[PDB]
Design an enzyme around this catalytic site. Structure first.
Site, mmCIF file in Angstrom:
data_model
loop_
_atom_site.group_PDB
_atom_site.id
_atom_site.type_symbol
_atom_site.label_atom_id
_atom_site.label_comp_id
_atom_site.label_asym_id
_atom_site.label_seq_id
_atom_site.Cartn_x
_atom_site.Cartn_y
_atom_site.Cartn_z
ATOM 1 N N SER A 37 31.649 58.855 46.685
ATOM 2 C CA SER A 37 32.832 59.219 45.854
ATOM 3 C C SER A 37 32.667 60.490 45.011
ATOM 4 C CB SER A 37 33.258 58.058 44.950
ATOM 5 O OG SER A 37 33.827 56.992 45.732
ATOM 6 N N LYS A 40 35.142 63.324 45.441
ATOM 7 C CA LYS A 40 36.396 63.454 44.679
ATOM 8 C C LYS A 40 36.378 64.634 43.682
ATOM 9 C CE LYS A 40 37.970 58.646 45.148
ATOM 10 N NZ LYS A 40 36.821 57.905 45.704
ATOM 11 N N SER A 281 38.114 56.246 40.692
ATOM 12 C CA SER A 281 37.605 56.528 42.061
ATOM 13 C C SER A 281 38.648 56.029 43.047
ATOM 14 C CB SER A 281 36.256 55.854 42.383
ATOM 15 O OG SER A 281 35.525 56.647 43.314
HETATM 16 C C1 LIG Z 1 32.948 55.977 46.060
HETATM 17 O O1 LIG Z 1 31.725 56.035 46.005
HETATM 18 C C2 LIG Z 1 33.701 54.844 46.772
HETATM 19 C C3 LIG Z 1 34.568 55.358 47.960
HETATM 20 C C4 LIG Z 1 35.275 54.194 48.637
HETATM 21 O O2 LIG Z 1 33.802 56.064 48.899
HETATM 22 C C5 LIG Z 1 34.720 54.254 45.828
HETATM 23 N N1 LIG Z 1 34.122 53.821 44.561
HETATM 24 C C6 LIG Z 1 33.835 52.499 44.536
HETATM 25 C C7 LIG Z 1 33.084 52.005 43.262
HETATM 26 O O3 LIG Z 1 32.211 51.104 43.379
HETATM 27 O O4 LIG Z 1 33.166 52.754 42.255
HETATM 28 C C8 LIG Z 1 34.847 51.742 45.186
HETATM 29 C C9 LIG Z 1 34.780 50.207 45.397
HETATM 30 C C10 LIG Z 1 35.965 49.453 44.767
HETATM 31 C C11 LIG Z 1 36.084 48.181 45.636
HETATM 32 C C12 LIG Z 1 35.103 48.400 46.812
HETATM 33 O O5 LIG Z 1 34.881 49.832 46.822
HETATM 34 S S1 LIG Z 1 35.267 52.684 46.567
#
Ligand SMILES: *C(=O)[C@H]([C@H](C)O)[C@@H]1N=C(C(=O)O)[C@H]([C@H]2CCCO2)S1
EC number: 3.4.16.4
Length: 443
Positions: A37, A40, A281
């Site tokens: 992420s 982003k 995110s």
């Molecule tokens: C970022 O590292 C990821 C994306 C999907 O690549 C997003 N961030 C997470 C988090 O743990 O912060 C997201 C989680 C929420 C529910 C399952 O994925 S996706």
């Protein structure tokens, strides 16, 4: 050095004062890694440069034809614009406005226009298995209520009987159960999976096994065909507003001149959406923005390839960052194809810091000890740096990335990129506590 966390793990790390010519910490900074992420951060910068802070996504109802005695002699066009925040009520309100304008009847077709985008609604390199999960819902041109819906799965009273699915009548999906209810003892429970199998036109079949349970199992799934889903919602709202039509619902995918706009909805400004995106995110904001960037830069229907080319071009030509062999596959970081070195992400962060009074970018990142994904991150909290780090996480199975800024004890801002993978909480915490404490105290 501080390096001693699990041996199976891969660290690439770079820390550099804002505006300095040389890094304070440089450990394998040229080595390319999965950004997750933190992708982003790049998406937000390219979006602000290409689209500007005041860009809004737009959805319209348009008429092509004359209106005679409340009858549109022609087609109603619902032109979707990839607004990730569009809701069922927005459709209802645009329909209310259409009626209010004097249209009672459509002698023609109802067109669901997604021509803003083309090609697949799923980026290259996304794992197939997550495509039915809401966090990976295809970020289509047609989105309503995040293209996510929920369902309740009930075990049958009699073992062997089919488990049954409850779903709200306002979701235009079609659910089938082939799920066998197991007795509490079952030898089948260990290796019999409970699966979702998507089919065409937003059909979903649940298969496999469910052990008897006293309360329903709640499940949320991603819509696979956003245009059909949005069409069905529009058709429902038309009928409820008493507007009839003689044709059918058809998809319009090819670019075309707009009709007369009779109703519209614009999203919140892009700066606000990018803030939500960075703080939470939000993959759907990230990936609708990403394909929008390509559409805006090249004046073509937005695709993943056009998005990638555009972001690369923006960074090089506007931000002075040549990303070289970097691979940019999407906006969210979902793609396992994304590949970037800390040294490249550092050039992006330096640009942001140097231009922050212009971009108002750093205030959008999670602030350690306050919000976003950094409200409580044990390593940062224990380093004593709450309130001092603004950074984006990238968190995956075994991936613990951080990219952002830290204000040190002497008041200087340092940019940093921590790409850490193959991790398999004590060791991470011990590493981050030490690392950020050092950066804060010694610079
Ligand atoms: C970022 O590292 C990821 C994306 C999907 O690549 C997003 N961030 C997470 C988090 O743990 O912060 C997201 C989680 C929420 C529910 C399952 O994925 S996706």
């Amino acid at each position: 050095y501080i390096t001693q966390l699990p041996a199976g793990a891969n660290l690439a790390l770079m820390v550099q004062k804002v505006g300095a010519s040389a890094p304070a910490i440089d450990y394998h900074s040229q080595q390319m890694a999965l950004p997750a992420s933190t992708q982003k951060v790049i998406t937000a910068l390219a979006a602000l440069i290409q689209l500007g802070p005041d860009f809004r996504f737009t959805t319209t109802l348009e008429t092509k034809g004359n209106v005679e005695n409340g009858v549109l002699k022609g087609d109603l066009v619902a032109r979707f614009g990839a607004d990730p925040t569009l809701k069922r009520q927005d459709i209802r309100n645009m329909v209310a406005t259409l009626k209010k304008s004097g249209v009672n009847q459509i002698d023609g077709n109802v067109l669901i226009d997604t021509s803003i985008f083309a090609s697949h609604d799923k980026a290259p390199g996304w794992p197939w298995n997550d495509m039915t999960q809401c966090f990976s819902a295809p970020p289509a041109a047609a989105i309503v209520d995040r293209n996510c819906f929920s369902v309740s799965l009930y075990s049958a009273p009699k073992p062997g009987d089919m488990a049954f699915i409850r779903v709200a009548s306002y979701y235009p999906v079609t659910m089938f159960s082939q799920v066998r209810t197991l007795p509490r003892g079952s030898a089948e429970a260990q290796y019999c999976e409970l699966d979702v199998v998507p089919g065409d036109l937003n059909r979903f079949t649940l298969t496999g096994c469910l052990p008897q349970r006293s309360e329903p199992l709640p499940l949320a799934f991603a819509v696979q065909d956003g245009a059909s889903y949005a069409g069905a919602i529009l058709k429902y709202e038309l009928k409820q507003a008493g507007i009839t039509w003689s044709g059918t619902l058809l998809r319009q995918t090819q670019v075309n001149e707009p009709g007369t706009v009779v109703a519209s909805k614009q999203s919140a400004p892009l700066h606000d959406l990018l803030k939500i995106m960075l703080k939470k995110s939000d993959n759907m904001i990230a990936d609708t923005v990403f394909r929008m960037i390509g559409h805006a830069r090249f004046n073509v229907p937005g695709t993943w390839r056009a998005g990638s080319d555009a972001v690369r071009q923006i960074l090089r030509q506007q931000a002075g960052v040549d990303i070289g062999n970097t691979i940019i596959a999407d906006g969210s970081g979902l793609s396992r194809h994304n590949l970037i070195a800390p040294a490249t992400m550092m050039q992006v962060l330096q640009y942001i810091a140097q231009h922050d009074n212009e971009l108002n970018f750093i205030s959008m990142l999670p602030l350690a000890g306050y919000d976003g994904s950094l409200q409580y991150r044990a390593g940062l909290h224990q380093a004593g740096v709450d309130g001092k780090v603004s950074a984006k996480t990238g968190s995956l199975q075994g991936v613990y990335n951080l990219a952002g800024f830290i204000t040190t004890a002497s008041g200087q801002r340092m940019a940093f990129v921590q790409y850490l993978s193959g991790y398999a909480r004590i060791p991470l915490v011990r590493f981050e506590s030490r690392l950020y404490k050092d950066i804060y105290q010694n610079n």
